[PDB]
Each structure stands twice: as structure tokens, then as C-alpha cells.
Design an enzyme around this catalytic site. Sequence first.
Site, PDB file in Angstrom:
ATOM      1  N   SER A 211       0.793  -1.223   0.000  1.00 37.28           N
ATOM      2  CA  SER A 211       0.000   0.000   0.000  1.00 37.28           C
ATOM      3  C   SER A 211       0.829   1.277   0.000  1.00 37.28           C
ATOM      4  O   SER A 211       0.241   2.356  -0.128  1.00 37.28           O
ATOM      5  CB  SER A 211      -0.960   0.043   1.187  1.00 37.28           C
TER       6      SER A 211
ATOM      7  N   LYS B 171       0.160   3.772  -2.776  1.00 40.60           N
ATOM      8  CA  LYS B 171      -1.005   4.655  -2.813  1.00 40.60           C
ATOM      9  C   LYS B 171      -0.590   6.110  -2.790  1.00 40.60           C
ATOM     10  O   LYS B 171      -1.331   6.979  -3.282  1.00 40.60           O
ATOM     11  CB  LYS B 171      -1.925   4.327  -1.634  1.00 40.60           C
TER      12      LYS B 171
ATOM     13  N   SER C 252      -5.940   3.348   3.979  1.00 44.55           N
ATOM     14  CA  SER C 252      -5.451   2.294   3.089  1.00 44.55           C
ATOM     15  C   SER C 252      -6.595   1.573   2.370  1.00 44.55           C
ATOM     16  O   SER C 252      -6.508   0.382   2.087  1.00 44.55           O
ATOM     17  CB  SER C 252      -4.596   1.291   3.863  1.00 44.55           C
TER      18      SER C 252
ATOM     19  N   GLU D  10      -5.434  -3.388  -7.107  1.00 48.76           N
ATOM     20  CA  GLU D  10      -5.717  -4.059  -5.847  1.00 48.76           C
ATOM     21  C   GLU D  10      -6.723  -5.178  -6.093  1.00 48.76           C
ATOM     22  O   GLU D  10      -7.653  -5.007  -6.892  1.00 48.76           O
ATOM     23  CB  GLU D  10      -6.278  -3.070  -4.820  1.00 48.76           C
TER      24      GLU D  10
ATOM     25  N   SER E 258       1.292  -3.406   3.771  1.00 49.17           N
ATOM     26  CA  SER E 258       1.521  -4.785   4.155  1.00 49.17           C
ATOM     27  C   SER E 258       1.020  -5.693   3.051  1.00 49.17           C
ATOM     28  O   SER E 258       0.166  -5.313   2.251  1.00 49.17           O
ATOM     29  CB  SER E 258       0.819  -5.117   5.481  1.00 49.17           C
TER      30      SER E 258
END
Length: 261
Positions: free
Chosen positions: A43, A46, A103, A139, A210
Site C-alpha cells: 500500500s 497509494k 489504506s 488491488e 503490508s
Amino acid sequence: SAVQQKLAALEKSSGGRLGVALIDTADNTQVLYRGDERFPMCSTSKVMAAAAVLKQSETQKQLLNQPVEIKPADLVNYNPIAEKHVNGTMTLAELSAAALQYSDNTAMNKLIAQLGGPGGVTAFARAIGDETFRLDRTEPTLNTAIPGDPRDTTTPRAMAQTLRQLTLGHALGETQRAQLVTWLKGNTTGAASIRAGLPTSWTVGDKTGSGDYGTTNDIAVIWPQGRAPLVLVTYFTQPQQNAESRRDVLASAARIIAEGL
């Protein structure tokens, strides 16, 4: 050096692979550990997607207020905020905040779509001089963190220099940079990572990440009181596909960096 000795000992104690890049903006000095090795971003990518949309808004002055539809088929595996707006709309500002501060993986995918796909995110990295960052997937598959897989990776050195330019430099216009900084400072996911290793007194803006193989990441801009800001990237990944997250390793790396000013 002393810090490289302790970071190497930390890594050895942890059983994983640790990557660190620190930039001290006071003298533009750098501290690097595995600084040129590739790590899965998870992440932490992002940040680049949100930055790319912010760059777009320098020309399309009202883009951040543009509403985007959230439909049931858009929901992926972790959508704390987008779930609250299924069958409604969120603006691109709200989607950027959700992706960065919570996230939210649906928000990330909406940002990728606004940029025309993963290649649009990567193109922005290149346009600010990052030739290492690569986003390949959306994602949630971008988090597979397979050892040796170059997809969706960057290096600590590269991410540190890019995060510096985005937040303390001028890769973005003024209002855009301040919005990014405001967003990073209001992260909610970072309390146990870099922040946990630094004096309670310092102001931090960060983005965690993660994924599989126990991948545990954090990238941060740090404002110590009465001292030039610092940029700190900590990447960590492990050999077993089902390994637990190890945010303590990131806090420990930050504590080692901080003791040596």
C-alpha cells in the site's frame, strides 16, 4: 558505520530482509541499508497514485471535487471507507484521503482508473524523475510480494527521494503539496510502525503497507521540533508466504535511525 551495524543486527535478529533509506534535509546526507534492492511496495504505492491525481488537478482546477460512483462490484478485499458509500458517490479528494489515511483498496483502484491504469501511475513517477518505481497491477493482486518478482516494487533510495520531492520539494504545486502533507499527517494506520520508534514530540506523516510474505512497510516524512525535516523509508519482507506482519521491526529501525540524529 554504527547505524549500519545495528540495522544489520536488527535484520539478523528478525529473520527477514530489511531495507532503509533516510534523507536528512539539513545537509542532504543519506543513510542507506539495502537501499538499491527491490522491495514489494504494497500500500505504500497509494502515495504515488494520490500524487498523480493531485498533479492532474493543477490543470483541471476542480477535479478533486468530481464525484465518482461506488458500486458493489467495485468493492475488493479491504474497503473500510468505500463500504460506507456503496451506491453513492465519493469525490476524488475523499477517495485520495481514504486511500492514504485508511489504506482503502477500492479508493486506490478508483485512483488508478482515473489515471488510465497502472501505467498512468508509473508514468507520473517517471515524469518526476523516478525511474525505479513500477506499478503493474491493481488491488488486491499487487500485494502478492513474491520473492524476486519485479512487479509492483521500488527501492528504498528511490522511494525516499521521490517522497522528498513530493512533500518537501516542488514536484507538485503549492496547494497540492500542502494537501498531500495534510493527508499524510492524518494517517490512522501508522501508530505501531515508524511512529512507535520516534520521540512522542515529533510530527510524522506516513503511509504504511503490508502484504503476503510478511511484507511490512512504512514511508514517512518527519518534522522534528527545531530541526530540518527528515524522510525515512523502511521496507521489510520475509521468506515464508504466510508470515506475520512485523511492524515492530519498522519501529526498531526508526529508533536506531533517531538515536544517531
